[PDB]
């Protein structure tokens, strides 16, 4: 399928989305540290043949798997700075996001 830039990142809470906007891109002037998400991107993934103990865990605790995996742009380790500019380039014919 088509890889999508969005804020609906699976298996990630709210604190990691605090610096992300509605589109999925951090604001200008955000203080970020290593491991922080800058651009939220979800990638379609194929079926996973989960191991028996894993399906035990899924049966007991619920938490059904999603169709997208988290492949997002994260700040490199030991790097902490301020976002000073964001540039978005879109192919012709693709919906230009809000940002």
């Amino acid at each position: 399928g088509a890889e999508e830039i969005t804020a609906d990142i699976p298996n990630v809470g709210e604190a990691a989305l605090s610096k992300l906007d509605e589109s999925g891109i951090v604001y200008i002037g955000a203080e970020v540290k290593g491991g922080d998400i800058l651009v939220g991107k979800v990638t379609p993934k194929g079926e996973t043949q989960l191991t028996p103990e894993e399906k035990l865990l899924r049966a007991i605790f619920g938490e059904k798997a999603s169709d997208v995996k988290d492949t997002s742009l994260r700040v490199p380790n030991s790097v902490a700075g301020t976002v000073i500019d964001v540039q978005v380039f879109t192919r012709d014919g693709v919906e230009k996001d809000k940002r």
Binding site: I25, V32, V75, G81, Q87, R91, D97
Partner: protein, 50 residues
């Protein structure tokens, strides 16, 4: 071809001087900082200027 979107982020980092950084003059006298000494521990003159 094949790409739908590109997002580019510029990060600004203020790097301070720390041990291991390489400092030099203009006469081939390079060096690596070994310690950031406290002010009171460094040599000073009669007027008190360290």
């Amino acid at each position: 071809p094949g790409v739908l979107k590109i997002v580019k982020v510029y990060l600004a980092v203020k790097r301070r001087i720390q041990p291991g950084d390489k400092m030099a003059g203009r006469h081939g006298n390079k060096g690596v900082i070994s310690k950031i000494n406290p002010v009171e521990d460094m040599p000073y003159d009669e007027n008190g200027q360290p």
